Symmetry: C4
Subunit: 112 residues, 4 copies
């Protein structure tokens, strides 16, 4: 049905910043002991209202990095089968990206 969301390039620096922001907040809010990182950015859509709203679909996986990330470098996807975890997530990120203002409005993740 009709809405005011339009597909947007995933190349866009603001989409990448929206994903950076969403994943920072996802990890802070999650009850998992491990950091999830981005396997792939799958799709992005933009709604223009009083703010910019990015609806972003990402594939994320459980890393071998324990929260909090701190200065840990080269986190890799879990290699232990019992800890391997892949999810498809949809994030709704509100922004005035020209003002560096981002807000995670909604999250939904499913196992894949």
């Amino acid at each position: 049905a009709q809405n005011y969301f339009g597909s947007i390039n995933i190349s866009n620096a603001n989409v990448k910043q929206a994903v950076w922001f969403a994943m920072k907040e996802y990890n802070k809010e999650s009850e998992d002991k491990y950091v999830f990182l981005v396997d792939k950015i799958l799709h992005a859509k933009l709604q223009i209202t009083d703010r910019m709203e990015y609806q972003i679909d990402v594939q994320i996986s459980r890393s071998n990095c324990k929260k909090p990330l701190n200065n840990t470098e080269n986190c890799i996807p879990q290699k232990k089968p019992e800890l391997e975890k892949k999810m498809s997530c949809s994030f709704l990120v509100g922004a005035l990206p020209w003002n560096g203002e981002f807000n995670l409005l909604s999250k939904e993740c499913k196992d894949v």
Copy 2:
């Protein structure tokens, strides 16, 4: 003229549309918010400022003004309130300084 086509993908074109629609809705004598169906075309004229001439299709939403944020806005489904328009906006900017100004608006029913 001195207008050249620019990509609608350009972050400053999207900010110019956001800015034009904020001013369109503030200035409108409507109960409802109009939102962007489609950005149709953009051209840029370079003078003492950047001027973006942007064509957009807008429609009346089911959201009453001022935009409340939490609500889900979609095009009107009620026949007497359905309204689609083709708009041309001229937005002046020094986008590197966060400065945008609506120079001109023109909307026609479609």
Copy 3:
């Protein structure tokens, strides 16, 4: 050399052309403003500052200086005032810091 071609679509090329043309017009003792017919080519060299060598076609407009708060500038239609040039500008910059300098200009008729 260390100059590489870049897309004229790039936001920083458009800011570099804005800066070059503002300085070109400020330096010119013409009573009319010159605006860009087309941006032709654009190259970037990365040293201590970003350097953009941009090739543009410009023409004498029907607007006299200072540009008015309203804007209706088109190429001159009076034969004795018609003037088109191919220009090369070298713009040095830290575009993230709002720092631009017009290092060099070169213009040829038609």
Copy 4:
């Protein structure tokens, strides 16, 4: 093995700023008499973690400009055979590019 770095378009303005930053640091740290400049940016990968991490492959060459570019001569690749030198470099640049914050995390250059 798996990691969280993904190839990105080298056209990206933040890749160009990352290379500007990396080359400034490369040249200040080098013991060469001459400035090295960029023949070509070859490839870029992005990891999104608590910061943006750019893994950038560049071809650099020894210029005819001696250090530190204070007389601002127009630099070209060396035309003297014994000074001609091309290298393939990998730079790892950590950044919050929306905040103008860049850090050179790693450099590695090889003759080609």
